[PDB]
């Protein structure tokens, strides 16, 4: 259920393609620059995500890199179901882009900045006492679901 639901969208910066996976219930993110927006590279990214978190369902934009039997085969193999797409990334790709822009000049290559931004986003809280970061929220949700 909610524990295994992720949204996958693409973002573009400096002629590069970035795939962003958001764990809906927590706001937690996994993002990476990929060589091209193809089924082969999208399948690779999804297989990487699935081996790190319990991915059960994904909501994508259902674009071209999903019509090929590549991504379909990967989702099949990993036990991932593809459902309804994203509406029309909302305040995520922009937010992630915001952090990236803020730290872009601190890294030589874009890939490093992307990861610095993912780190900042997932460790971000919302006040003292509790607050809870997206990183803590995802772990709590999955923990209190597998037990």
Separation CA 117–CA 94 (nearest Å) = 12
Considering only 12, 14, 52, 76, the residue that binds a second copy (CB under 8 A) is: 52
Report the partner that residue 128 touches, choosing among a second copy, Cl ion, none (CB closer than 5 to 8 A by kind). Answer: none
Give the number of residues in contact with a second copy, rule: CB under 8 A. 35
Is 145 annotated in a binding site? The answer is: no
- Site for a second copy contains 50 (CB under 8 A): yes
Separation CA 105–CA 85 (nearest Å) = 34
Which alpha helices (H) appear in the chain, and where do they start and end? Answer: 39-52, 69-78, 93-103, 110-123, 134-146
Mask 122-141, x = binds a second copy (CB under 8 A)? Answer: xx-----------xx--xx-
Considering only 43, 96, 99, 100, the residue that binds a second copy (CB under 8 A) is: 43
User: Which residues 6+ apart lie within 8 Å of 97 measured at CB?
Assistant: 11, 13
- Token pair for 6: 């992720």
- Site for a second copy contains 78 (CB under 8 A): yes
**DSSP secondary structure string for all residues of 7-38:** EEEEEEETTEEEEEEEETTTTEEEEEEESSSS
Q: Under the rule (CB under 8 A), what is the footprint of a second copy?
A: 30, 32, 40, 43-44, 47-48, 50-54, 77-78, 108-109, 111-112, 115-116, 118-123, 135-136, 139-140, 142-144, 146-147
Which residues are part of a known binding site for Mg(2+)? 9, 61, 90
């Amino acid at each position: 259920s909610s524990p295994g639901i992720w949204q996958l969208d693409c973002t573009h910066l400096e002629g590069k393609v970035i795939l962003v996976a958001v764990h809906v219930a927590s706001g937690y993110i996994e993002a990476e620059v990929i060589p091209a927006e193809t089924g082969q590279e999208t399948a690779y990214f999804l297989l990487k995500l699935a081996g790190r978190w319990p991915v059960k369902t994904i909501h994508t934009d259902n674009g071209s890199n999903f019509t090929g039997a590549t991504v379909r085969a990967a989702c099949d193999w990993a036990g991932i179901k593809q459902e309804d797409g994203i509406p029309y990334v909302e305040s995520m790709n922009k937010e992630l882009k915001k952090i990236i822009g803020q730290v872009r000049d601190q890294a030589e290559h874009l890939k490093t900045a992307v990861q610095m931004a993912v780190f900042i986003h997932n460790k971000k809280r919302k006040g003292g006492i509790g607050g809870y970061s997206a990183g803590e929220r995802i772990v709590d949700i999955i923990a209190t679901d597998i037990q």
